[PDB]
Each structure stands twice: as C-alpha cells, then as structure tokens.
C-alpha cells in the first residue's frame, strides 16, 4: 500500500547493529528496528561522495539520551542531557554532556570508520488495497514464432513478425477486410508488428494399397517443411 523510505548515514562498523532484535549503542538510543520489521537492510559504501578532507562536522551519532528510544522515533529536540544530580539550566558543565558530537570520517580510515549510506525500506503491511495500481507488468518480445500474444487485451496466437507499415499515432490495433487482427502495435517500443495466423493445414496420408505394401507417406498441405526420413 505505502512504503516508507528512511535514509540515514551511520558509521562503518554499525552496518549490522540496525537489525530486528539487536541491542546496540546506536540501535537503542536512535532509530531502532523492532522484531516485526518486514523490510530490508539495503546499504552501500559512500567513501567517495560523503568523504571530505576536513573535520567532518556534519554527521553525528546521538548517544547521550535519558531513556531508550521507541522504534521509528525521530527526536528533533536539542535539550542538554543530564546524567544525574547535576541540573544544567544554562551551559553543559562537567557532568552535563551535549547530545551531539562531530562524526569524524577521515578519508585515510579503512573499513569500519567509513561513511555508509543505509536506507531501510519499511514495508507497511496494513491489509489495504494497493492504492492505484497492482499488476500492470510487461515481459520481453518474442518474434518469428507462433506464440500466444496478450498485447493490451488482444488475446489469441500467431507468428508475430515485423511489418513495413506506418500507423498514425492515435491508432493502436489493426484489422483487414475480413474483421481479423492482422497488425498490432508494441505498447512498449511503439513499433509496428504484424500478427499472422499460426501455421496450420491438413494431413494427407498417401497409401499405395494395403494389398501391395504398408509403407505410406504423409502430406502437410500448407507447410514449408519448417514446422515438422525424406
């Protein structure tokens, strides 16, 4: 029905900490995945885009928190954390610590301290209709073979080939003087394809007489010896 895409950059050694049922320092006091997370942990390396030869004062980890965070919780407040018996109404003292800190991602650091962009695909599985569209999927294009075609409702079978006919750009189907679909339009490539009837005919068994012999020959009327010894 509706997928929620949440993107965030974390450290290079906490890729597996954000998992259903995991107690991590950045998985408990931050965005937490519950035991019913039916999404993915799709992530990649970003050591080229997010890297910068500077102090890297753009990312943080948000470790200092009073209590544990609920799953899918986004804390926007910037209040000063209080450890215990030390209220800081102004600036943070010795016991008071700020809830933010620069996440230094040096380009010389190896695997474990590199910036990794992690985005979870939280799939809301509420039993509800799939908004506006459900299937609406197409396959590839097989030609020069009698197969079943289902081009935008038109059902049947035949040898789909290529035709040198230029349809006007408002007509989709195509017929003849016998009310038979003889040409269709590819709904994907917007090309003109010729639909020809599947190769059929009549089998005729040539028999010189059972009294003479038993060797017989078959005749496939209307076949070019390609659709199935002398």
């Amino acid at each position, epitope marked *: *029905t509706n997928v929620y895409a949440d993107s965030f950059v974390i450290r290079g050694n906490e890729v597996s900490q954000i998992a259903p049922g995991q107690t991590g320092n950045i998985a408990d006091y931050n965005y937490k995945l519950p035991d*019913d997370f*039916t999404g993915c942990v799709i992530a990649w390396n970003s050591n080229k885009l997010d890297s910068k030869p500077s102090g890297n004062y753009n990312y943080l980890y948000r470790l200092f928190r009073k209590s544990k965070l*609920k799953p*899918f*919780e986004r804390d926007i407040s910037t209040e000063i954390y209080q450890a215990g018996n030390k209220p800081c109404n102004g600036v943070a003292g010795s016991n008071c610590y700020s809830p933010l800190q620069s996440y230094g991602f040096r380009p010389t650091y190896g695997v474990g301290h590199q910036p990794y962009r992690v985005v979870v695909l939280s799939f*809301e599985l*509420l*039993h509800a209709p799939a908004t506006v569209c459900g299937p609406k999927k197409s396959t590839n294009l097989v030609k020069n073979k009698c197969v079943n075609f289902n081009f935008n409702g038109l059902t049947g079978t035949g040898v789909l080939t290529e035709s040198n006919k230029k349809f006007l750009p408002f007509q989709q189907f195509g017929r003849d003087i016998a009310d038979t679909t003889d040409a269709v339009r590819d709904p994907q490539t917007l090309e003109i394809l010729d639909i020809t009837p599947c190769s059929f005919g009549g089998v005729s068994v040539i028999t010189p007489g059972t009294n003479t012999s038993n060797q017989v020959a078959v005749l496939y009327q209307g076949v070019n010896c390609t659709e199935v010894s002398n």
Partner: antibody
Amino acid sequence: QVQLVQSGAEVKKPGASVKVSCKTSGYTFTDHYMYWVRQAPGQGLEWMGVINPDAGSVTYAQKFQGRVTMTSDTSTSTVYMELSSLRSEDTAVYYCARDLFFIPAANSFDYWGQGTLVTVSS
Amino acid sequence: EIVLTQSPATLSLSPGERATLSCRASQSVSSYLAWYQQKPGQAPRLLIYDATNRATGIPARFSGSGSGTDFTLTISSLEPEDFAVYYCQHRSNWPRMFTFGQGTKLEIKR
C-alpha cells in the same frame, strides 16, 4: 497532556448509520496510529481495526468486513467511524485507542478515549 | 484466529497477597502479547506491553513474565485500586487479527 476527547450519547434506528468522532490532542496527529475497539456491557473487547492519519490506508475487522468505514482528516485531527446497518447486537460503548509505536509498527494500546454509548432502540 | 481462552476466569484473593492470572494460547506468542486493565466505569488502561518489559505510568508492583504458550502476571501486593478486570492480546505481524479473551475479575475476600 495527551487526552483523546470523544462524543457522548447517540441513539439510532435499525438500518442506519451512526457517525462518532474522537478528536486527538497533545501529540501531532501524523505519526501515531489509532484503533477503534468496541466494549460491550458485560463482555470485553471484540473487534480490532486501525486508521492511518496520513492516508486512507486502513484495515477493518474480519467480523464486519465491509459494513464499517474509518476515514481520516488532518485538518482538525479527528477520526470518524460510520457503522452501517446497526442491529440489536451492536449496542455497546465504542472507544478510540492509540499506540506506543509509530506508523510502521504496532504493539498495543496505551492512550484511550472516554467512550460513546451507542444504542439502537426507540 | 488464535482463540485466547482463560481457564480460571475468577480470581478471588485478599488485598496484600500475590496474584497469578493465566492466559494461554496456541501459536508461538512468546514475544507477541499485551496485557490490559479495564476498571468498571472508565476506559481500559495498558498494564504490561510486549510481555517482557514494563509500561509507562505503571507502579513497580505490576510484574509480568512468561514465554512459549503459558503466561501469567505476578502482582507484588494487591491494593484497593487494583481490583479490576484484566485481558490479554497478541500482536500478529502480518495478519492484523488482534483478538482478546474473556477477562478475569479480581474479588475481595471478606
């Protein structure tokens, strides 16, 4: 303080539809889900069902399955519940319950309303 | 759906002792269970959620535990404001079919 205000008493007739609202307050009506549960006199909670504050992505119960509609409204942050074709066994007190988790997950019901005595008789 | 059934259905004890009310199920609900408390004259309140941790605004006397298919509530000391009806609810992941039981009334032994 998060307090869910609901309606009071409301009478109807067999073969009609009752509109009962339950307005939210205290929290932003964009991240917390809500459930509409029925409490019968002497019995307990019977049917589940969640309404999405963002979109109309809802999930009705299996007992009704069609004869109930739950809309959403982000203007005044108020939910709605319209039960159709009320019978002699639907007379009970309806409640609106929130959840401790956000939109994706849902654990249990923590914040409840006050109730709405919906009865069907002259 | 998992028919949540309560065997005792009537817990008549005295204020001050310990109480143990059970609500068993069939499917593995070791991590999928919720406990409520409905007092007569108002709306039910959340007592213990997830059946493993403590809820907010709940005194220390309420202690819940259990795993597998047998769960029970371990109240430390009964109080006059604790006599109410408790329920149980499981949280299925995919099929949202949250059901309930019948309720256990807590009586006073005069």
